[PDB]
């Protein structure tokens, strides 16, 4: 009965988008208004045991009054003969449809000190072109790990910003600038290792990698601000999008493409580009033992990237579909929310892995390649 | 027996030798080649028509075929002995001879110091002007404003490649960055050049849509730019030019039909990069012009100003991109065999880096056309309506 009224509201929503005349739009909105009023009186199979006078059955009923109110606004535009305006008011209904632990701080700090220690070891031992990318990656990793105490304290006050709205934009962007600079230098490292594997034959690339990181962190500086979430009654540092569902889905999609898809394309093309070349050699003696060892070092950098960043990017794509209206079951939406800070920690863990993948096995890679 | 038709025969049978399983199949293709090579030695190149037959240019041409016939006879000696794998290996050596021909019959000392300086003086300016846009959006905090950001980002990435080309041109076209960078930076250049053009189009459609009166368009514009830069990614590679002793980053088309590919790709550059975009820019301008001329004394001053802003974006596009696209169409006809005057061909080559620079200059103009007159367009449009 509840799935039968929401199917009607979601069916006609698609109709409004594919409609060309205002008579088509008014017809779908009339079928919606009736279904919204008919759904307002029904009890869902999740709250079928619940009482009608409960505070849960005070706000969820109020939610429909908002939905009917938004349908009437769209109806007023359609009756005036305003297709583009009534179709725009229908996009606001999508946003209404979507609206319908001590271990975490300890874990943020334990990986902070470790990551700072292993990366301060890289900067000091370094103190070649490949070695110039190691320094920059170690610097970008060090600055990213340095922001961990801030997010640990932010979570200790259960999502509360007490540092200022300027710090929300400044430290918010600084986080994104170094996260991308770390990802984009991992890519440089994979392209260089591939270039050396094929042919044994950098003051422009390093400033470009920082410029691309500055550009990719501009929506972070444009949207991040201290806001009051009326739902929880708290002051949080969030992406203050204009009146919102479209922007959250669009930005979630940009996080995956620039931060995982495009980088992983490169990491994977370089690994299989190194695997194909070293397989065409056909080694038999101790060279078969040597080629396998080189291949293991090539396999490690691509496998460590997907172990550290795939859990978070999977959660981000699932969240994007929620704002689109694909996934609507609140039970599944709650799981994404709970798992999110553990997925965010794996991203920071990649900075602890990096010294072992490139610097600590740097000399070994070149010596075993010049051998085969 | 027209040299080009003789090369088609030599290249056709080369493919036959590779797909052949018996020595009788190989000897048959080599016999057809030997005849075609002898028949091409008596022919005059479709550009050396003016030059005498005893000239040193005509001497190396007839000599290049004596090498080619000599290599065919070596392969024939193997095929007659019943040596398929050996005759097929000798056929791979003909490929090296055919490539030494196409480099010559299809200089770097045309160098000017002015070109690298001009590439840098517009790089810093463009970068500065585009950063100003990015920073002013930051200071400020619309759908149109979301296309300004993307266009500025595309422009910034395109300008960032100018030091690579001002350096490549300075080493008389000797690529010292690596063959991987030739594919990577070659495609990156094309990806952002199209993304800049395709977002100019979005901006003109939006300004027209508002004059009469999105989270899907921006990713599609980048996807269309990715697709349009696939022939650059597939063909850009470092190739050795033995004549100059210089490794150059060039479009490595199959030498089997190299002239056909250069003409076909030159035409794709004009349709996707100028014709289709210009159709939209021009339809939107005259679409806006038709709306303001319909629907005064005091109210004519304001409408004229709005039309001047509409006229600027279409006129700046043809000033920046028409010189290069004209040169590209003239070059396509050279590959076809239409224009054969080396005097006229030399002019295209000399003018081309300057017509290339105008394309990059469009990125310096863009901040003045959309961001710096952004507020003015909306305030004067909400006035007339
Ligand atoms: C190495 C992990 C990096 C990382 N560290 C984080 C640390 C803390 C927070 N959280 C949640 C949290 C958990 C514990 C305490 O708080 C925050 O409250 C928060 C506050 C201010 C700024 C930023 C985040 C999330 C992340 C988080 O998602 N990430 C990943 C990440 C980052 C930015 C972008 C990004 C990229 C392009 C365009 C826009 C954006 C963006 N996303 N949010 N704003 N801007 C994409 C992925
Ligand atoms: C904003 C101007 C953009 C621009 N910058 C360029 C910068 C440098 C070079 N030149 C010549 C030069 C001059 C000075 C120093 O070197 C190069 O040597 C060169 C080297 C590697 C990659 C590319 C170009 C040319 C151009 C150049 O023609 N263009 C215009 C352009 C670009 C690509 C395409 C294009 C579109 C669809 C399919 C295929 C292609 C294509 N063309 N060449 N490869 N791929 C069409 C027009």
Swiss-Prot record, chain A:
GO BP, sorted A to Z: angiotensin-mediated vasodilation involved in regulation of systemic arterial blood pressure; blood vessel remodeling; brain development; brain renin-angiotensin system; cell surface receptor signaling pathway; exploration behavior; G protein-coupled receptor signaling pathway; G protein-coupled receptor signaling pathway coupled to cGMP nucleotide second messenger
Expression (tissue specificity): In adult, highly expressed in myometrium with lower levels in adrenal gland and fallopian tube. Expressed in the cerebellum. Very highly expressed in fetal kidney and intestine.
Membrane association type: Multi-pass membrane protein
Keyword Ubl conjugation: no
Transmembrane intervals: 103-127, 132-155, 166-191, 202-223, 247-272, 298-321, 335-360
UniProt GO MF annotations: angiotensin type II receptor activity; receptor antagonist activity
Compartment list: Cell membrane
Keywords, in A-Z order: Cell membrane, Disulfide bond, G-protein coupled receptor, Glycoprotein, Membrane, Receptor, Transducer, Transmembrane, Transmembrane helix
Ranges facing Cytoplasmic side: 273-297
Entry annotated with the keyword Transmembrane helix: yes
GO terms under cellular component: plasma membrane
Parts of the chain on the Extracellular side: 156-165, 224-246, 322-334
Effect caused by changing residue 364 to Q: Found in patients with X-linked intellectual disability; uncertain significance
Consequence of substituting residue 155 to A: Abolished angiotensin II-binding
Region of interest (Helix VIII), ranges: 364-372
Outcome of swapping residue 179 to A: Abolished angiotensin II-binding
Main location, first listed in the record: membrane
Binding site for angiotensin II: 154-155, 224, 244, 255, 319, 337
Cystine residue pairs: 168-237
Family per record: Belongs to the G-protein coupled receptor 1 family.
Domain notes: Helix VIII may act as a gatekeeper for either suppression or activation of the receptor, depending on post-translational modifications and interactions with various receptor partners. Helix VIII is found in a non-canonical position, stabilizing the active-like state, but at the same time preventing the recruitment of G-proteins or beta-arrestins. Upon switching to a membrane-bound conformation, helix VIII can support the recruitment of G proteins and beta-arrestins.
Oligomeric and partner information: Interacts with MTUS1.
Function description: Receptor for angiotensin II, a vasoconstricting peptide. Signals primarily via a non-canonical G-protein- and beta-arrestin independent pathways. Cooperates with MTUS1 to inhibit ERK2 activation and cell proliferation.
Protein name: Type-2 angiotensin II receptor
Source taxonomy: Eukaryota, Metazoa, Chordata, Craniata, Vertebrata
